[PDB]
Design an enzyme around this catalytic site. Sequence first.
Site, short mmCIF file in Angstrom:
data_model
loop_
_atom_site.label_atom_id
_atom_site.label_comp_id
_atom_site.label_asym_id
_atom_site.label_seq_id
_atom_site.Cartn_x
_atom_site.Cartn_y
_atom_site.Cartn_z
CG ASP A 101 3.73 -0.25 2.50
OD1 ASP A 101 3.45 0.29 3.60
OD2 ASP A 101 3.24 -1.36 2.15
CG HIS A 143 -15.03 -20.80 14.58
ND1 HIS A 143 -14.87 -19.43 14.61
CD2 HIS A 143 -14.06 -21.28 13.76
CE1 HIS A 143 -13.85 -19.10 13.84
NE2 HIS A 143 -13.34 -20.19 13.32
CG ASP A 164 -0.59 -1.15 2.21
OD1 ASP A 164 0.57 -1.23 2.66
OD2 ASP A 164 -1.50 -1.95 2.52
CG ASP A 211 0.83 2.29 4.90
OD1 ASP A 211 0.22 1.67 5.81
OD2 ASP A 211 1.94 1.91 4.47
MG LIG Z 1 1.36 -2.37 6.20
#
Ligand SMILES: [Mg+2]
EC number: 2.7.7.6
Lengths: 49, 90, 1425, 183, 107, 30, 98, 59
Positions: C476, C1076, C472, C474
């Site tokens: 990276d 679960h 991404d 962000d």
């Molecule tokens: Mg990440």
Amino acid sequence: TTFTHCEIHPSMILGVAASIIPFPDHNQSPRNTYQSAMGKQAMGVFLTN
Amino acid sequence: KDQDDRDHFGKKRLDLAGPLLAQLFKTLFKKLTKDIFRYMQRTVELAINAKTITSGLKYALATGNWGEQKKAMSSRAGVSQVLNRYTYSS
Amino acid sequence: VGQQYSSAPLRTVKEVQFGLFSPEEVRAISVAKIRFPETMDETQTRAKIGGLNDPRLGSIDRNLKCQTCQEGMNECPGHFGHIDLAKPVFHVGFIAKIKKVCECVCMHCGKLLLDEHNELMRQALAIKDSKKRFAAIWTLCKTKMVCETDVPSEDDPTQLVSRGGCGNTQPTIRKDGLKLVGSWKDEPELRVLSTEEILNIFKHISVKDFTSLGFNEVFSRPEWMILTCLPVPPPPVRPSISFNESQRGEDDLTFKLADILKANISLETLEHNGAPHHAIEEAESLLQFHVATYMDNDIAGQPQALQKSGRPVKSIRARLKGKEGRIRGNLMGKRVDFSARTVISGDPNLELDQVGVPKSIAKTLTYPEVVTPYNIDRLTQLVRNGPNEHPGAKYVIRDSGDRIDLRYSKRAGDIQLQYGWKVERHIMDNDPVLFNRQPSLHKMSMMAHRVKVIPYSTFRLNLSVTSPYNADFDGDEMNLHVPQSEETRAELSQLCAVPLQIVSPQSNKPCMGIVQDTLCGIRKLTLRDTFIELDQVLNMLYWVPDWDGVIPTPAIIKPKPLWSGKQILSVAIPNGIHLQRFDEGTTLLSPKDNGMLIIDGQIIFGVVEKKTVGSSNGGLIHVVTREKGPQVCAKLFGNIQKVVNFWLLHNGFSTGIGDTIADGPTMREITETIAEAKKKVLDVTKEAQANLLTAKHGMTLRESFEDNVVRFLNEARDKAGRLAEVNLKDLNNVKQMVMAGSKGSFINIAQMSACVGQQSVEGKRIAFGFVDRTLPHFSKDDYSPESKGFVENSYLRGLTPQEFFFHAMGGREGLIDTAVKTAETGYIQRRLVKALEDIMVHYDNTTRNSLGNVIQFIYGEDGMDAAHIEKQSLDTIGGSDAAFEKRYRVDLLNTDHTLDPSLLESGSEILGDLKLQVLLDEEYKQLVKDRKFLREVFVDGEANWPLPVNIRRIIQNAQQTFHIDHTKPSDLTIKDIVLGVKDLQENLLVLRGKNEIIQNAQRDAVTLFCCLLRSRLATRRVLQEYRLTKQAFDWVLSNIEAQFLRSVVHPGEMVGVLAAQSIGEPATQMTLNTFHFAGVASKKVTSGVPRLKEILNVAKNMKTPSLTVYLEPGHAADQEQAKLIRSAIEHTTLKSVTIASEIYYDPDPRSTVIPEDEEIIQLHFSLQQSPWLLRLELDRAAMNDKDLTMGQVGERIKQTFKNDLFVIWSEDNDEKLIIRCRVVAEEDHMLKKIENTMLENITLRGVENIERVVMMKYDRKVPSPTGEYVKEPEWVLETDGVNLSEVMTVPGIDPTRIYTNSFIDIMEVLGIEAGRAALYKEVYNVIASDGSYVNYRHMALLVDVMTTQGGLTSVTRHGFNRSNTGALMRCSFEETVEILFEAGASAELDDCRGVSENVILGQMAPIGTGAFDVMIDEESLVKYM
Amino acid sequence: NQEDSMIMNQSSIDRGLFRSLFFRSYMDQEKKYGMSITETFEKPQRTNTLRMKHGTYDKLDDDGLIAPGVRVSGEDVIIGKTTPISSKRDASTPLRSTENGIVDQVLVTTNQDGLKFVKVRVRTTKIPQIGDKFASRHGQKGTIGITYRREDMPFTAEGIVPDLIINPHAIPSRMTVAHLIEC
Amino acid sequence: IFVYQNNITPSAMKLVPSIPPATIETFNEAALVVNITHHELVPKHIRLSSDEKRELLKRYRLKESQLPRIQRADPVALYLGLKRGEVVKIIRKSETSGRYASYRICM
Amino acid sequence: SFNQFVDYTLQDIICEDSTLIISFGKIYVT
Amino acid sequence: SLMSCISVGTDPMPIITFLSEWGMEPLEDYVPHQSPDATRVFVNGVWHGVHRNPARLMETLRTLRRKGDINPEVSMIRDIREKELKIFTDAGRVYRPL
Amino acid sequence: QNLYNAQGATIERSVTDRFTCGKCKEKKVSYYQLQTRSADEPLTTFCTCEACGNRWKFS
Ligand SMILES: [Mg+2]
Ligand SMILES: [Zn+2]
Ligand SMILES: [Zn+2]
Ligand SMILES: [Zn+2]
């Protein structure tokens, strides 16, 4: 009808970090958990001296 | 009665500043007392190396390696950090 | 490399002959007498003493000197010096064996302790494998503790034969610190075993005795585990560090040696002076200590041998020890030159294969080019351009092997390049690079790219290549390595290139899609409701770089000529493209504009989105890539993107709170839909507070309570939302992102505009940490939803203190099983990988490892490459015997079962031919023989499978490529079809061999396919279904023969690693410790990562050891028949049926002081002992659940002790069942031992270990008499403990369908091959609960690897890493130093055939590119002029 | 603006938007040796040793330090220091190879043992550039992917234009309504 | 083939390998109760003449050891009583390709 | 916490196994 | 949190010496069965005896605190359904304000 | 009562009418979300065709 005590205000369950998030009560719990790890990587005025 | 919930906050203590130092001050203050001895035990007849305490306390708050010097990592690694001055909040 | 030519010939390493240093060689090799422990100061004078480090060895001070050898510093590997020890020592690591060896030979005469004479011996002396032929011989001699003088020969045990003499008892031995101590026996004799002696003995061990024990006469005698002459490693090994002059900082190692030296001297000086006999051995241990602590420092003998300041010390070993150290840290992974790294971002303007490098880097990274007539002009140009202007260079190099620093060197501007020179130049547009993001566990984590120098400091990549890297923007950081040779850059271009990677082998499907904007927009652009006018239509057309420059005739013309979004987007889709879809309500007129038709590259109908243009299987991409070429494809993203992106830029797109607020009424309608769900809870609340709740199979009333409440609220959320989801108009952005599928799920809609939901911790809704409640803002024992954690508000209204808080606890969960999962995930990932390194498809199409051992005689049992496979259907399997005939059946002899002439040309002139109904039938009896074959394989009935060559499409193409018309008849001879489709298979060769064995294996690897083939190329099919013509047909056959041939696998493909990666990739994403089921304890089973751990580990004590057993044939739906066997298995013990045990004082065996007991006694006397009674009341209810009868019970107890304990018992009709009995000198005491012996060692009905067992109604699918496949349910028992061996031999079960999730057993019982089957089966599941596909072949390979060998070889240090694989390779995993030691110990020899083997010698490893040699045929080199 | 990365209007970047200051600060002391031998803060040059740095000492005064106004950059020296060894070995301290800026404040002080103590502070200014990271207060971190200008930026009849452009796809799956609401 | 019931004397068993060529085997009753080889998972094996093997090798360029192995004591190895050396031809069903030959030597 | 340590705690520590075979009285914090 | 804080560590005796003078029957002279409704009293983890009718012993301490006579830090709990009186002084107890 | 005590708990689950299977192409599937990825991407959501039996992820 047993209320021994009352809460000043709920907000106080938070910590520095979150306290800054606006409307934390409108986001997936995890979002606020991250934002409280970045306001630490941001910039500002750490003092005035 | 169920077992005892190990994770009930009312049974968790948070050792803060004072307490921590306290610990140090003791173990240290004793090495001094057992060194004040070494002066008398030699007096076949002014002996207080105050540096011991002074230095000790630094070392600790300095690094964070509480339990002390010598040949041992003995301490809890990670106490006493460098304040964050990234922002006021932080 | 290393500069300076050398006459010396240049070769490669082929073998690695590990051995051990004979003292004699140590000296031989040595150049330094190494006497003094000091470093230099010839009394302070700076230099080096002819003492330690350089009494000739390497040097320092930038001085050639190295025994004239000069070459100085760089270009000179130190030389070894030696240092004679005063008294022999142990080898820290070898102490282990030195001991064991002794245990294997008696001292004094030193000889084996078991000749050919003792039989158990022989059986050992034959096992060829010095590694076990040892731990065997030892297991047989650690016991013999007397050097026998004579033993009975092969004749009479009366006649004694002699061998080697002296029986001097052998001492047992124990390891104390670093010395060996043994005892002799009558009151022991404890004396220390002097090294000086041990050595001797060893020295005296025989040649054949060496060998017999894991040793070697030449490279490693045992006598060499004892150090006599210590090799002293030269400087480059223990380099110093100078702070200019007068300031020297030496290396740890240099210090130890010192101490070792010091220690040594102080010892010698004690044997040539006042030698206080046993005050010496007090410093001999010091030597041993240092000489030992030097190589290793992490022992059990505590003393860490610290070095003043508390610093541990760095044992040689400490250096190699994995991760961060020599083997794994410097060799398997190096830091490297010509590498870069920065933040990355998205550029909707680059091509897929491109990577925008910022100039800054281009100007720093250099590709050494070779000056050649082809370039000289352009090259010199750069040189001139300097190393600051972009298109430039920054070094030139002459044949004389010397650098020219273009940034300085007076003659910078000068220089006339030369043929044969090189010019390290700046990276320029279009250079092939190795882009990548970490962490790397995917082939698609490192793909080559077309460079594209650009401004600003961020690496640029195309969105659609985001997922392969899984990155991404962000912030990276990504990496980048630059090729260096011409052949190197070719390996990146022709192999690792982004477009070459579009279809993923570990999921036989596209791994690159179309996202966000592009995607979210390509839809808005598609709609029927989307019309574009001239002006724009043009700019778009233009944007597309391949636009044939033909403005396409407007969909509409009437008053104002317009074009449809679909219309122009179509310009992006090449020609020859064909794609049929059909979603739900689809009908070649799809009113909802569902599905999609694309013909000759033109969207005929249907809204484009994720399904059509995503990483889906038969998606647009999947096609284009397979139909046109990797090239054409990549180039496709662009276009779409550009066209789309552009239109979006102008139509615009947004998102906002308005998209989260729903129609006023739909809010109330929700509120009450929530409230109603509260009462439906409240009801079940009191209805359980009034004890009116059916326990339910659900076990536990309480447990059964929740499962109803939860299920009630969830049911409400999902549905509370299903309201908003449908009330949000088709103009709500959020919905739009969802429809296009760019981002978002309907859930996200609920939780925002309708209602969050019930939170959770380990399943069980918010617990009671607060003594019988949730928050102190609650009344004790409140089980209502608003307290067990149910968030009623929508993210729009906003949680409440309580809601908020629980919600938290709830989320914060993942963030944890991610902190731990991450810890073990990694390890798995590696092991797999480190286990299947060497596995690659060789040239015979076999699939072997670094040894030669097969592991598949055909990759995936089909020799197909994962890349070429999809979910096609086997029409033959499914369907009723009725329709099957109405489809593939052709009878030329029958008015109602012959091909209506309106189909075939020679139709009417066939009806009757008897020579064709021979073929026409040979076909049928085959599709039939097939049907059966399949149903014997895919029992499930499942018809959809992964198979090369998509034939559904291959025909769809054949269709509109010849514009075939469904009106006029074909022209195919029925001989044409059948006789051709028969020749086709004759050519889908996968294997080739000239002999039978192979030509037989061929027919096999082909089978499953043809069946699909014939299934499709059915004479009745070919004509009545898809009107093919001789032409079309003959085409369809052509492609298939190819598309198949291309689908094969390439003899090189390192599948091992591929396989590995593909399991760990998903392994990593697996959730952790979830369960679960929790909230229904007792029905708890191990699932998830901890399980997978359990596997690869080959763990015995598995958490869940269940085993499902199916009944015998008929006996199925026989409800009762069920328990009838339940109780015939589920271990039942007296203790389970008892309600008490009492000891009474009844002395009159003719009347019990107990009332209620009377009637009994009276009965056992109409039709000696002891007065001590023991009475056992039993549970009635517990005597039916698991059928039983008083008789039986006691009857057992009686035949349990037999004749020596009197027993009696009431009758099945008494309101109180019982069992009285007495014994027959302390009676009470003994009558309690028999109190236990009566509860835990006594069985009644059942098998041991198998506690609980239960019945279940499974839905089995099975052959209806009519042919169809139908659901014929059956009851089955699931154990909860496991002892197959015997639950198998029980009547009523089908010991053919039995199964224990514990393959470990199903292997011991049923046999390996089946074991595998289980193994693979278990594994497939673990991975498949996440809904994670992984093409068989991989797991398959893994599994096959584990098995083969013999049984279950684990994927761990304790397993596969012990195999017949060479050192270094294993050396590269968990046991590093240890390994090596016991390598040179047993004189190992390394093939150097295993990847790691080479990566460690920096040689080209036999792998794909390296799976073969290349050559120059001078003879073909001539005819080429 | 795609996949967690925004478009930040350059124009406003210029008008001062998100500009940051950044101060770093080196420091050194004149180590001492009981047997009387002290380091020093001078501007040396060759003279026996040769062991100096590539940096340009020419920005130093005579006391071994730089003075405010100065504009340091690459590996220029920032502090001059010499150790007498048995005589010109450098102990000077360069400005971190990758930074660059303007000295901003220096200061010499005494250190208990009566040693010379200095602390140089070089300030720089950083402007919102592409690779730079940004974020709101709802874990909405993103980076810049390009800068546009009022001309290219989309505008509102009112006249106004955006300082920042985030991708709507950073909303659904993340469901951060508070960001949405703060707006 | 000898079929004991509860067990044999360790004094007894040590007499089998004392009369070559002839060979002897030993099965417990509770063992033979069910024929494993009939099990859903177990697929049919097959012995190979000392020629069909000297072939298999030749045709695969195999060194005895490079061949997948089966445990002498492997249930099915017993059911067909193999010897150190004989090879079995495991022929199973495959979801990749209906059939799939395979082999196994005997260690 | 610090206050506490200084004011009280500090003193209490000094007074325990202090006295030897010499005593320690009050303590001042400058 | 924001409001939260932490115990610093008070002294016992001023509560111990306070108790045994308001009801608590020293443990030295305790007799089980003689007192079943025995709500044994605890302080900083120690059993300093028991006490009969505690209803009052409680609201006496509470109001003793709420005046400032017992450090407002210190915590005392009444586990009625278990007949126990938990009183703490300990240094390290996180506590909010209400 | 003993029959009863012999049957294995039934995982009961809801089915949403806006969620679809890849085989048995039917709108009867169940789901449960977990936090597979870090706090920056959130909610994985796993599906299960409660009738034909396929499972999968959404991210
Ligand atoms: Mg990440
Ligand atoms: Zn040399
Ligand atoms: Zn002997
Ligand atoms: Zn389904």
